[PDB]
Design a protein around this ligand. Structure first.
Ligand code: BCL
Ligand SMILES: CC[C@H]1c2cc3[nH]c4c(c3C)C(=O)[C@H](C(=O)OC)c4c3nc(cc4[nH]c(cc(n2)[C@@H]1C)c(C(C)=O)c4C)[C@@H](C)[C@@H]3CCC(=O)OC/C=C(/C)CCC[C@H](C)CCC[C@H](C)CCCC(C)C
Ligand SMILES: CC[C@H]1c2cc3[nH]c4c(c3C)C(=O)[C@H](C(=O)OC)c4c3nc(cc4[nH]c(cc(n2)[C@@H]1C)c(C(C)=O)c4C)[C@@H](C)[C@@H]3CCC(=O)OC/C=C(\C)CCC[C@H](C)CCC[C@H](C)CCCC(C)C
Ligand SMILES: CC[C@H]1c2cc3[nH]c4c(c3C)C(=O)[C@H](C(=O)OC)c4c3nc(cc4[nH]c(cc(n2)[C@@H]1C)c(C(C)=O)c4C)[C@@H](C)[C@@H]3CCC(=O)OC/C=C(\C)CCC[C@H](C)CCC[C@H](C)CCCC(C)C
Ligand SMILES: COC1=C(OC)C(=O)C(C/C=C(\C)CC/C=C(\C)CC/C=C(\C)CC/C=C(\C)CC/C=C(\C)CC/C=C(\C)CC/C=C(/C)CC/C=C(\C)CC/C=C(\C)CCC=C(C)C)=C(C)C1=O
Ligand SMILES: CCCCCCCC/C=C\CCCCCCCC(=O)O[C@H](COC(=O)CCCCCCCCCCCCCCCCC)COP(=O)(O)OC[C@@H](O)CO
Ligand SMILES: CCCCCCCC/C=C\CCCCCCCC(=O)O[C@H](COC(=O)CCCCCCCCCCCCCCCCC)COP(=O)(O)OC[C@@H](O)CO
Ligand SMILES: CCCCCCCC/C=C\CCCCCCCC(=O)O[C@H](COC(=O)CCCCCCCCCCCCCCCCC)COP(=O)(O)OC[C@@H](O)CO
Ligand SMILES: CCCCCCCC/C=C\CCCCCCCC(=O)O[C@H](COC(=O)CCCCCCCCCCCCCCCCC)COP(=O)(O)OC[C@@H](O)CO
Ligand SMILES: COC(C)(C)C(=O)C/C=C(\C)CC/C=C(\C)CC/C=C(\C)CCCC/C(C)=C/CCC(C)CC/C=C(/C)CCC=C(C)C
Ligand SMILES: COC(C)(C)C(=O)C/C=C(\C)CC/C=C(\C)CC/C=C(\C)CCCC/C(C)=C\CCC(C)CC/C=C(\C)CCC=C(C)C
Ligand SMILES: [Fe+3]
Lengths: 51, 44, 255, 182, 76, 325, 102, 102, 51, 51, 51, 51
């Protein structure tokens, strides 16, 4: 370590920054939708059932 | 695209060394994860 | 509805009439496509005994533009080459021929050119059709990557020079040729490459057909502002012949 | 034997192209027609589970096969990929007719007149419809249309058997009961 | 800048795939969700290739070009 | 690999072309104003416009828009002026031809009168677009090949809509104006008169359609392979033979034993395409008027196949065995 | 070579009609009448079509069957409800279907 | 076709829809079923319902009495209940005359 | 955190502004529709059932 | 051999790293999904069963 | 609000007028058709039933 | 909040005005149509209901 900063001498800051944002949002949306497709982890149905 | 047109000798030793530093870090993390998973739900 | 005789009715009559018309049409179509390359010859240049089942068509005349004259076909072959450096590999017919010297320099095989007119092609106003971009009022690169200033790499991996200009067809608004200035190590002067034989990338321009050592023998235009049809044919055929003659492994079976 | 003959024909065309120093567009175009035939006698039959699903070799008996195979899905006109394929076929024929007519009319003017050039052809078509594809674009477009016609034909047949079992009109139900509709 | 256009069309393709899976979790069938996914792709990816790729780089160059268009008019 | 010439590498743009002229003064009726599209320019030309406006084109446009609006407004009124339902059932609606009981007389507007008024406006529109195609060649001092090729398709158009209904004695024989409804007409027409496969002119039309598509694959591919020798400049190759024409001819000569010329291949293309609607119209005109059952006609003329095996699923399997029980 | 065949998915061929099992859970074997058995008309006040039937056959037909096959729990209890009047006709129609349309 | 879950080449050879020599044996039983449906609608189903059925069973337009067709009994299957023997246990619904318990 | 302002030395503000506006509006519309697709959080049906 | 750094002189780091990253992510996602396809190791169903 | 006249220093009068005319006619036609599509506000049917 | 006027140092006013003019009408039409697809807030059916 202490030499990971040299990653920016090979990869372009602008290409890495757009790709990472797209990947991060897509992964977050996918995980939230996977949770929404279950029974034990769907909070919208949990709210209705509780009350 | 090749503008580097080949690496040199001393521009590769440092690379190997940094690459090896990440590979060992990723593997230590994976080993701990596998150990915890085996403790939770064994498969053997 | 009734029949004329037996089972013959109006549909049968129509079908047989179409049969006759189609036979005549096939005859006309095959005869119309025999205005070039006939009569047939053997492998020694003499007229062949067999000429086929269809006779030759009668003559048509074309009135050309810009005072170029008239063209009557079928007629004599005016695009014929005179002294070809070729050798028979057999005593009869049906076998290939062998080049006598350098096939790429002699214009034989896939490097063959046809003896076209020694004048440039004109547009509607009577002006040469293909013009270098440095003399074409109002034209600019509107899309894609501009190749001017990039180095050129040959098929064996050598840098031979730089792109200096582009030659465009102004009537159709299309790039036709790229102009290359050679380094002193690989020759002198300027050469042309047709657009269909290059791959333009971000840092280079690739020509795979020929190698670096072949770049000095590309035919050269007489005037720096216009190119005739004969020169066009000789330049394009030179690049086309390299796909087979650049390396000895390109000519042998690939297996 | 037919598969072997077709593949050998394509590989012979490749060698002729190599000897003449030309591009390899013609064998690539013929490969599409080979793909539509291998789908009809090898791919659909293997997927469906029996060689008896291929069409017979007869001048008037291979039309009976076509008729019975389409009514086995009730109304074949409602197949979505067959509609795309028919459109491609009709468009190729309209474009071939236009191209041949334009070239012949440029090369054969009325008696006593001079021949015409590409400028005249470009002008006639912008006057007629307000656009002209050009002398190079028309060949690209014709090739692309023909190859798209053969690819979509292969798709229309390989979904009719192994992917869909009911009538083709019923497939449109997804549009008729979309939740947005009142 | 044909490379930004292709990127923008790919973000549209990706939004279309996400629209299909989202409508299916809410109760729609595949083909119903995929028609809506195709329109998300074509409308949004097209809109972004005009708007984002049309904010081309130029900095004081942008300024002068615009201040000179503002001189064409005035005498037009 | 080598460049293949399907997409242009770099585009160049200059002043817009306004067109050629002669003593006929085509400039007076041309619109001013052009555009450029770089998306299209990857394949073909990028310039858009200008267009010529004569009287034939204006009349054709006006009368064709009228036909479209009579159909569209009839379709909208059939549904109760409900726009969302109009959108839902767009592919299913149509403007129906008259009922068979009225013969060739004028039917009630609710039962085919609007269909006849709209058919008269589409007729006028189509014949006007053809007079424009003839006039422009005459004005440009070119041949009339385009107009003849268009009249070839107009022949089948008129046979389907005008000639056959008159010879049969009913306006009810015409085609409805709809997407699905017109495809149902095709299937019902084939069923009503036996099997249309066994109509010989239908087979000839299929022969020529298949041949026309095989020829654009061959011609397009051949021209794209000789573009490294200037082969897309066809007219100058006709006026002065070059190596591109020679190589293109020799490829097919060595492949299948005969070849064409640069000028003569376009005659082949023109004839195959033109021959499809002519044979199709001759085949359609003979149905009902002469032949009423094409399969019985084939049996009479001895080109109907015969089969030896039996009919029925229980001649080959069992209902329980097909279910796995 | 004809193209005459009918296609089906094998997951669909292995799924039986789901009402076959409902039927088998609502059906019973007939009871053979004995010597001089008492009929339904000598035990209640009924209708002619169903009167010369015995008591046990009356029981299985009416409740165990007709009231479960048509989900009407009180069928044929009030002789004036319209459902009884239509069920009496349906019995004869069901008999004629089996008899004359074999 | 949609009522039996089959297609056109079931009962037909599509090159000649008219020819009796190219039909399958199922065509004849379908022809019998046409007449059976026509008789059941006109003689049994319509007459009752015009005399007993309540106003809430009379359909959107014309105040029509509901009718039956081929799918009322097959339900998208080749045979009703895929061929279950449902008449062996109920001899009382099998004949118009006295129930034969032999 | 005190040096995040340098993000504008890599990203063109015009492009990011347009993209962020489109992204934010699309996210808001999707969330509102997801709420509308349920039973306990549909405020158009609650008004009907509370009057 | 004792130092294997001599393998990057026959390679270009850029594409090697890109391919590595894509391969790693795809293999991890496929293993996670394969585990999710199993009855005994689906941790979302186990929470519903331990309820 | 006293300076709303400055919109003409941004948009050309010629184009805006054409778009306004097209928009207004299309909106009026759509509203008249929407009224015609109902039972209560269809004045032709009301005139038919009131006599 | 007192420096928002610099938004026009980045954006072209003509493009922004055209986009906003399209967006506002599209959103208003969408909301007016969403109201009509319910039972409680459809003012065309309510008028007939109370007649
Ligand atoms: C159940 C279906 C029947 C069947 C029923 C019919 C019927 C019925 C017909 C065809 C016809 C044809 N059939 Mg068939 N056909 C069947 C099976 C097939 C199969 C197959 C199984 O593979 C094939 C390949 C074909 C193919 C063909 C074509 C060869 C032929 C149409 C000729 C033509 O020029 O079309 C191209 C179409 C035209 C030229 C139409 C003319 C268009 C006009 C000129 C347009 C004017 C402009 C317009 C109004 C303006 C629009 C707006 C603009 C944007 C401004 N059939 C089966 C057996 N077939 C036709 C024919 O000729 O029969 C012999 C015909 O009528
Ligand atoms: C079978 C061939 C079909 C055809 C094709 C066709 N027509 C065309 C085009 C094409 C491919 C055009 O690109 C061109 C056009 O610009 O259409 C909007 C056009 C055209 N065909 C027309 C007429 C026409 N075509 C007809 C027929 C047909 N043309 C067939 C349907 C007919 C009839 C009834 O037979 C008519 C009357 C006009 C609608 C139009 C004439 C072109 C014109 O007047 O251009 C003026 C120039 C402009 C400034 C307008 C361009 C729009 C943009 C503001 C320019 C910027 C370009 C932008 C980047 C992309 C947008 C362009 C898109 C078309 C991709
Ligand atoms: C976009 C795809 C289109 C296409 C493309 C295409 N086909 C091509 C080419 C191209 C580009 C050629 O270059 C090549 C050629 O050389 O053309 C002259 C060819 C060709 N496509 C042909 C025909 C053809 N193409 C067709 C269609 C199409 N081809 C499409 C429309 C059709 C039909 C049915 O529509 C036919 C009939 C050939 C004329 C030709 C070259 C094929 C050839 O010669 O193959 C060598 C084989 C023999 C000489 C004989 C083989 C004998 C067999 C062993 C036995 C016969 C068995 C057979 C299956 C029986 C069938 C009976 C029928 C009655 C059903
Ligand atoms: C040889 C037979 C083949 C053939 C050839 C052929 N077709 C032709 C021609 C030729 C040689 C022409 O010259 C002519 C032409 O103009 O071609 C560009 C044409 C033509 N063939 C056409 C259609 C056509 N041809 C077909 C078939 C075929 N034509 C065969 C494959 C088919 C089918 C069913 O397969 C169709 C659908 C037209 C594109 C054109 C005839 C133009 C014509 O007569 O137009 C009348 C115009 C109106 C209806 C008035 C306009 C009203 C419109 C409803 C709206 C406004 C116009 C607008 C431009 C369209 C909408 C787009 C919007 C975005 C604006
Ligand atoms: C502008 O550009 C262009 C051109 O140009 C300028 C062109 O032109 C064309 C071409 C287009 C046209 C000319 C238009 C017309 C074309 C069509 C309509 C296409 C349709 C074509 C046909 C219907 C006919 C095609 C014929 C075919 C496919 C079969 C022909 C093949 C054979 C007869 C046999 C092939 C021979 C082989 C393979 C070699 C022999 C094999 C051996 C082992 C040799 C050993 C010797 C023997 C066995 C004994 C003798 C053998 C003999 C005599 C051979 C014959 C065989 C027999 C069995 C007798 C295009 C598109 C073009 O865009
Ligand atoms: C310069 C060179 C010229 C070359 C060009 C010539 C082309 C045309 C020339 C001649 C064709 C003559 C062939 C005629 C043979 C059949 C006879 C016939 O047409 O018979 C019909 C039966 O209809 C059919 O059998 C349907 C025909 C389908 C249409 C074409 C099929 C090509 C499909 C596929 C191609 C495959 C084989 C191809 C082979 C080419 C075959 C034409 C009725 O009989 P009739 O005589 O009308 O009845 C009255 C009587 O009974 C009185 O009593
Ligand atoms: C009955 C006979 C054929 C055997 C039966 C089975 C195959 C049937 C299918 C197709 C036949 C195509 C056979 C063509 C083979 C040609 C071989 C060849 O190469 O023959 C040349 C002579 O041929 C030619 O010059 C071209 C002939 C026309 C090509 C086919 C046209 C297909 C048109 C339309 C489609 C056809 C469908 C029918 C429509 C029915 C319509 C009622 C010798 O050399 P040449 O140097 O060119 O001599 C000439 C000159 O130069 C003198 O000097
Ligand atoms: C290898 C295995 C073969 C595969 C086995 C499969 C069987 C079927 C395949 C192919 C059949 C075609 C075979 C014929 C090819 C002959 C070879 C050839 O052509 O050989 C030439 C010799 O010429 C000829 O032998 C002339 C052939 C005449 C063609 C007829 C024209 C119309 C014909 C058709 C019209 C169609 C209309 C409708 C039709 C119905 C109506 C017909 C050498 O030429 P050359 O020495 O250069 O010069 C001389 C030159 O000019 C002319 O003499
Ligand atoms: C209904 C369709 C029937 C089937 C298709 C055949 C008919 C279609 C038309 C033509 C076919 C090709 C035949 C003609 C061309 C052959 C080439 C030819 O004539 O070669 C000559 C030699 O021949 C002759 O001297 C003529 C004698 C021909 C006799 C054969 C007849 C074949 C008849 C039939 C085929 C095979 C039968 C054997 C099997 C049984 C059936 C299964 C060499 O001299 P040359 O150098 O060419 O002369 C120079 C000249 O050209 C100057 O201009
Ligand atoms: C059960 O069946 C299925 C199919 C499901 C399976 O599961 C099958 C599974 C297998 C067959 C699995 C096989 C798995 C492998 C072979 C895995 C191999 C994995 C690797 C080799 C991974 C390598 C990862 C590398 C990483 C993380 C590198 C990191 C490097 C760095 C952070 C350093 C680089 C950065 C810098 C600064 C370089 C320095 C730069 C300079 C300029 C000096
Ligand atoms: C309401 O919304 C608006 C305003 C936007 C609209 O206008 C909407 C419009 C539509 C949605 C329109 C939709 C239109 C279609 C789907 C049209 C489809 C049309 C066809 C498929 C037409 C086929 C026509 C004809 C055919 C197949 C063959 C032959 C026809 C003819 C030759 C017709 C010519 C008729 C003659 C010569 C008879 C005239 C009578 C005399 C007495 C002279
Ligand atoms: Fe051409």
């Amino acid at each position: 370590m202490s030499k990971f900063y040299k990653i920016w001498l090979i990869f372009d800051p602008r290409r890495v920054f757009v790709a990472q944002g797209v990947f991060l949002f897509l992964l977050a949306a996918m995980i939230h939708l996977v949770l929404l497709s279950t029974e034990h982890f769907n909070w919208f149905e949990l709210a209705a059932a509780n009350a | 695209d090749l503008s580097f047109t080949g690496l040199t000798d001393e521009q590769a030793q440092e690379l190997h060394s940094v690459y090896m530093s990440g590979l060992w870090l990723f593997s230590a993390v994976a080993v701990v994860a596998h150990l915890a998973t085996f403790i939770w739900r064994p498969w053997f | 509805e009734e029949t004329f005789f037996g089972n013959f009715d109006l549909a049968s009559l129509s079908l047989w009439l179409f049969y006759g018309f189609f036979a005549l049409l096939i005859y006309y179509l095959q005869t119309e496509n025999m205005r070039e390359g006939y009569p047939l010859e053997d492998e020694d240049g003499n007229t062949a005994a067999n000429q086929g089942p269809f006779p030759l068509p009668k003559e048509k005349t074309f009135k050309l533009q810009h005072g170029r004259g008239e063209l009557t076909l079928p007629g004599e072959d005016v695009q014929r080459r005179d002294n070809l450096a070729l050798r028979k590999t057999a005593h009869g017919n049906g076998f290939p021929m062998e080049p006598t010297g350098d096939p790429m320099l002699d214009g034989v095989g896939p490097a063959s050119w046809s003896k076209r007119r020694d004048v440039p092609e004109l547009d509607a106003h009577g002006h040469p059709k293909i013009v270098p971009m440095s003399a074409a009022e109002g034209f600019g690169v509107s899309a894609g990557t501009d190749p001017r200033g990039l180095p050129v790499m040959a098929g064996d991996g050598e840098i031979v020079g730089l792109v200096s200009d582009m030659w465009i067809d102004e009537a159709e608004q299309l790039v036709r040729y790229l102009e290359l200035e050679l380094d002193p190590e690989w020759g002198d002067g300027k050469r042309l490459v047709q657009r269909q034989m290059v791959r333009i990338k971000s840092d280079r321009v690739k020509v795979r057909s020929i190698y670096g050592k072949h770049f000095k023998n590309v035919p050269k235009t007489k005037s720096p502002n216009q190119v005739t049809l004969l020169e066009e044919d000789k330049i394009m055929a030179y690049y086309a012949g390299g796909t087979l003659y650049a390396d000895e492994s390109r000519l042998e079976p690939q297996l | 034997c037919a598969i072997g003959a077709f593949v050998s024909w394509a590989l012979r065309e490749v060698e002729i192209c190599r000897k003449l120093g030309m591009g390899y567009h013609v064998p690539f175009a013929f490969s599409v027609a080979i793909f539509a035939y291998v789908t009809l006698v090898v791919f659909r039959p293997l997927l469906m589970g029996a060689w008896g699903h291929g069409f017979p070799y007869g001048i008037w008996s291979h039309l009976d096969w076509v008729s019975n195979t389409g009514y086995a899905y009730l109304h074949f006109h409602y197949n979505p990929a067959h509609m795309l394929a028919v459109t491609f076929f009709f468009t190729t024929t309209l474009a071939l007719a236009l191209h041949g007519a334009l070239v012949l009319s440029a090369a054969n003017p009325p008696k006593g007149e001079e021949v015409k050039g590409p400028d005249n052809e470009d002008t006639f078509f912008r006057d007629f419809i307000g656009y002209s594809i050009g002398t190079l674009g028309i060949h690209r477009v014709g090739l692309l249309l023909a190859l798209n016609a053969g690819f979509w034909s292969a798709v229309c047949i390989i979904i009719s058997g192994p992917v869909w079992t009911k009538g083709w009109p019923e497939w449109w139900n997804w549009w008729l009961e979309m939740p947005i509709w009142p | 800048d044909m490379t930004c256009t292709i990127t923008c069309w790919g973000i549209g393709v990706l939004l279309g795939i996400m629209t299909t899976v989202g409508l299916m979790v809410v109760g729609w069938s595949f083909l119903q969700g995929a028609f809506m996914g195709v329109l998300a792709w074509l409308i949004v990816g097209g809109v972004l290739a005009v708007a984002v790729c049309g904010k081309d780089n130029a900095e004081q160059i942008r300024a002068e070009m615009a201040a000179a268009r503002e001189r064409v008019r005035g005498a037009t | 690999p080598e460049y293949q010439n399907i997409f242009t590498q770099v585009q160049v743009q200059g002043p817009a072309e306004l067109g050629v002229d002669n003593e006929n003064n085509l400039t007076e009726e041309r619109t001013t104003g052009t555009g450029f599209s770089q998306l299209i320019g990857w394949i073909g030309n990028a310039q858009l416009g200008p267009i010529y406006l004569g009287w034939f084109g204006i009349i054709s446009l006006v009368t064709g828009t009228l036909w479209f609006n009579i159909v569209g407004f009839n379709m909208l009124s059939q549904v109760g002026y409900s726009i969302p339902e109009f959108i839902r059932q767009l592919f299913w609606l149509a403007l129906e031809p008259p009922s068979p009981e009225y013969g060739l007389r004028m039917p009630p507007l609710d039962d085919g009168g609007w269909f006849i008024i709209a058919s008269f406006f589409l007729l006028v529109s189509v014949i006007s677009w053809w007079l424009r195609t003839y006039q422009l060649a005459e004005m440009h001092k070119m041949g009339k090949h385009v107009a003849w090729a268009f009249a070839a398709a107009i022949w089948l158009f008129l046979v389907l809509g005008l000639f056959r209904p008159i010879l049969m004695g009913s306006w009810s024989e015409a085609v409805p104006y709809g997407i699905f409804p017109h495809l149902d007409w095709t299937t019902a027409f084939s069923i009503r008169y036996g099997n249309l496969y066994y109509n010989p002119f239908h087979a000839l039309s299929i022969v020529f359609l298949y041949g026309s598509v095989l020829l654009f694959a061959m011609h397009g591919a051949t021209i794209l392979a000789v573009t490294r020798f200037g082969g897309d400049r066809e007219l100058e190759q006709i006026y002065d033979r070059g190596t591109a024409s020679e190589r293109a001819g020799l490829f097919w000569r060595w492949t299948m034993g005969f070849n064409a010329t640069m000028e003569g291949i376009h005659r082949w293309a023109w004839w195959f395409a033109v021959l499809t609607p002519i044979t199709g119209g001759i085949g359609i005109l003979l149905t009902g008027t002469v032949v009423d059952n094409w399969f019985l006609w084939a049996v009479e003329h001895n080109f109907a196949p015969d089969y030896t095996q039996d009919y029925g699923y229980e001649a080959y399997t069992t209902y329980d065995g097909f279910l796995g029980r | 070579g004809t193209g005459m065949s009918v296609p089906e998915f094998v997951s669909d061929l292995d799924t039986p009609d789901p009402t076959i099992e409902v039927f088998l859970a609502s059906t019973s074997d007939p009871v053979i009448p004995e010597e001089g058995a008492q009929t339904a008309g000598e035990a209640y006040e009924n209708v002619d079509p169903v009167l010369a039937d015995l008591t046990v056959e009356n029981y299985d037909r009416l409740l165990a069957a007709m009231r479960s096959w048509t989900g009407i729990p009180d069928l044929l209890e009030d002789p004036d409800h319209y459902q009884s009047k239509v069920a009496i006709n349906m019995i004869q129609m069901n008999q004629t279907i089996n008899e004359e349309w074999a | 076709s949609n009522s039996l879950g089959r297609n056109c080449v079931f009962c037909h050879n599509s090159r000649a829809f008219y020819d009796p020599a190219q039909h399958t044996p199922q065509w004849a039983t379908a022809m019998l079923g046409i007449s059976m449906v026509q008789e059941l609608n006109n003689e049994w189903i319509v007459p009752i319902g015009e005399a007993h059925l309540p106003p809430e069973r009379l359909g959107p337009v014309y105040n029509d009495v509901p009718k039956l067709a081929c799918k009322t009994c097959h339900k998208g299957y080749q045979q009703p209940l895929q061929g279950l023997n449902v008449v062996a246990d109920w001899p009382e619904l099998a004949t118009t005359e006295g129930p034969f318990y032999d």
